[PDB]
Amino acid sequence: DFSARTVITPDPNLSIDQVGVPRSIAANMTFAEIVTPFNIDRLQELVRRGNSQYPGAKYIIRDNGDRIDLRFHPKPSDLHLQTGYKVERHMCDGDIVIFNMSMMGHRVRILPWSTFRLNLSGDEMNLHLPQSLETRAEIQELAMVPRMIIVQDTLTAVRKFTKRDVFLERGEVMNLLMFLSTWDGKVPQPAILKPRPLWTGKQIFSLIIPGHINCIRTHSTHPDDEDSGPYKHISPGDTKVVVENGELIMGILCKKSLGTSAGSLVHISYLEMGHDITRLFYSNIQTVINNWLLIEGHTIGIGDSIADSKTYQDIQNTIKKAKQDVIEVIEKAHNNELEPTPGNTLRQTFENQVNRILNDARDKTGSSAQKSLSEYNNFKSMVVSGAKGSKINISQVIAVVGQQNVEGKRIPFGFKHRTLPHFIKDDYGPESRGFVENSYLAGLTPTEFFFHAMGGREGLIDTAVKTAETGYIQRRLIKSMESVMVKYDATVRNSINQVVQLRYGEDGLAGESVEFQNLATLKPSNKAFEKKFRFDYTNERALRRTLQEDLVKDVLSNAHIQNELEREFERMREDREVLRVIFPTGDSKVVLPCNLLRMIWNAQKIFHINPRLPSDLHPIKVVEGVKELSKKLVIVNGDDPLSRQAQENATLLFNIHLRSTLCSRRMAEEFRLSGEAFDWLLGEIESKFNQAIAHPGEMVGALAAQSLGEPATQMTKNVTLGVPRLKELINISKKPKTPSLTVFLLGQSARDAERAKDILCRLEHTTLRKVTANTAIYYDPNPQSTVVAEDQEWVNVYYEMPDFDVARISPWLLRVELDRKHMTDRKLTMEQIAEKINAGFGDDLNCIFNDDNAEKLVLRIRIMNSDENKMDDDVFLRCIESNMLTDMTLQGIEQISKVYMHLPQTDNKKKIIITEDGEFKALQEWILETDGVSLMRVLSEKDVDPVRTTSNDIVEIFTVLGIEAVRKALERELYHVISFDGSYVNYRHLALLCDTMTCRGHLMAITRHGVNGTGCFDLLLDAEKCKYGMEIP
């Protein structure tokens, strides 16, 4: 029953799950309901109301299937209903509705006005009402908003609310706590009892936090040196967020701490408590902060934009300095003083130098503007909390708008060598080329306004096409993975029943319950890892402090326990080695189902564990308990070797992290957990992991498409990225836009710069055109004439030897000059060039070379004597001259236009090799990124790494390395574009897309159709269980 579309308005009072609907719309919509004795009277009164009154029924259906309209009401007897009938009663409060393939259900609330109300935490919408009870029950159980998961008007106030400065009087506290649904009813004790009570904002927010959840976060304006300083725990600026036992002891909240992220209060509560409790957390924050906002208040005005005169002079001074610097650069290029970089030309190099000067000025002036704003300033409050806006937006409002680039470059010369008629011809100054030095508040000049419009026009055009293209990808991905689902054997299969993945995400765990954490058994070197993990029982004094007197005696009494302690460390050391191969990059961050560090902290608070007293936990219990826990955690149930082998692989990382986190030394050194605490810890891990198992019947394919399509909207050597690359990744078109190849060098040359140039030349393809200066066809009657005067001196001595002079020689010539500068860059030699011409073309012509030491290089080519004795020699020379200047490769590989060589500052490109000590170190290795794909020939080259040399073109990798290598390459390219803008996507979703494309052994283009179900189990009735039961009537 689709409804009439109506606009959307916000309503913080309503819960996020609840939705407001007008009376008129609900009157038209009807919900068939089966009448039962327990609610026979309820349907009897509603039907009596009629359709004139809103709480009525449009139609009533009898057992035989006949529908009687209630508008007429012909007979009172017909109005009366019997048990088992279906009544289409109008929608009322408490009903479940579903609207925007993943749809979220909502609980309808009737409101007086017409427009729909949604507790966003505008666009028209239509809400669908599930008529059947079965689907209504299912929707409310899995499709509700709490299971699907803050406005910018609340995050900004939240940061102000938690500020230490905020103090609340008794009267104010009463109002804030009244809106708190999850309130025990007891007013907390004031922080400042005298001279007058004053509740801090955190104290009120402490009750908002549900249950006891512990996490540590940092405010956006958190100085880096503050953590290293002695005031790390006592933050000078309250920039550190710590929560203990559900109480916000310190720290100002913001998007980083309260907003959705890998680690946040909402995220931690979702895993610790669930979705229902998490929703109340959202509602409490929205309601309480809104009431407080009426007291504090949030605003914005000219005063925020108006900065102090001191900063205005600095901004103009920086702008003036940048403008003068640009003129100096222009003057250097005008006088030919500027020297182009070897990897760029003069015109492009000048555009690069000027761009940096203007770009740097905007950032420097913009950064000063951020410091200019005071705490009271409203502009700073928004950015500091990170709710809305950005530091760049403030920069364009206060300091400077910045350069207005068009098509990735400055304003082009639309007119004859001038951007606009006002500017002189061939003007490359700041104002002429579109540099906007005036902020929005100050006002732009007439020239700047048009240039600003040109820049804005490009963004609008890109935005218009970006949505169209991005939306196309979302539909295409869903169709190709619509049938992908997890079956009851913990396998991912499609409609055809083909195995896409043995285990979902290669681990068999849901992508929602997994939490980010960093196991600490791979980063420490061989000196810190041993000290931090290997238990040392030789120190009598140390053990007494850590363990009670009896425990120290027990461990040193029998050698059986001592062997186990060393054995446990050996497993950790063995786990250390296997991690290195699994993680060559060495990054500690990794995705795991449940967070042990947080869970351990919860155990400490629940049991009130203090590190001062010795821990009563037996170290042998930790190793024994962990051993038992590992067996209880099962992914591939069975006893066959394949199941046992798969089980170890599936839980390889989890077991390694579990053992490292839970060991004899750590549990007695820092964690200090008691015997009872450890027992509770083991049970919690077992329960959390069990809940993390991928539930059969989950549309992982559809989830992956939604998870992959959402970041696609926020996407948009020159490497094409964003939508253009994402389009070229799903599409297997043989010719991408910029099929770049990254070449990694090995050995001594990988470190030196000059030694890497010869490799650059031998990979780059160079033709005679790029190395030649000029060519001509001269006439010489006899061989000794040599009409050219300059070359007569050197040709004579060379020609004395009768080489190819055994007979008559044609009087034509093909003398061609070679550029001196180009030869030096390629380190070419005259003999090398001559050899290729003779060998490449054969014995059809003969070439003569001059001395290399000569300032000008002369290359004379004449047709071979054998062919001399229809284009005899004159027209043929013209024909051959063009051929050797176009399709002649002196040295290099075809399809390689240019090679970019530069030391990689990024860590991923840099080689990471394990040092002797153990700590990871990344050396500096030269990398040659080259345009075009020649991986087959580039790999088979001297001084080129055959292992780390990978291309970005999946098609090339398929024909060289195979489909299996493409799966990893496709993952890297998909992750590279997704991570370019800072967004992150779970690996399981990315792996699923690659597996489906490569499931058939060859690259498959994503289904272009893009047109766009819980049937793996059936419910069966049992008579044995029905023997008991009494009818309600």
Partner: protein, 59 residues
């Protein structure tokens, strides 16, 4: 459209002469050389063809 053939193509005679101008007439399906058009006009002499195209003989 008085087009000019690209140098990309290679041939026995095409490479020698290289780049030649071809003009397509509105009612002629194929591309006929521009030089022939002037001959049809009445300028049989080849020098007259260069006179109308090349104004600066010194260059």
């Amino acid at each position: 459209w008085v087009s000019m053939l690209a140098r990309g193509g290679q041939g026995a005679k095409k490479s020698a002469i290289g780049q030649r101008i071809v003009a397509t007439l509105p009612y002629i399906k194929q591309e006929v050389p521009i030089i022939i058009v002037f001959r049809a006009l009445g300028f049989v002499s080849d020098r007259d063809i260069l006179e109308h195209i090349i104004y600066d003989f010194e260059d």
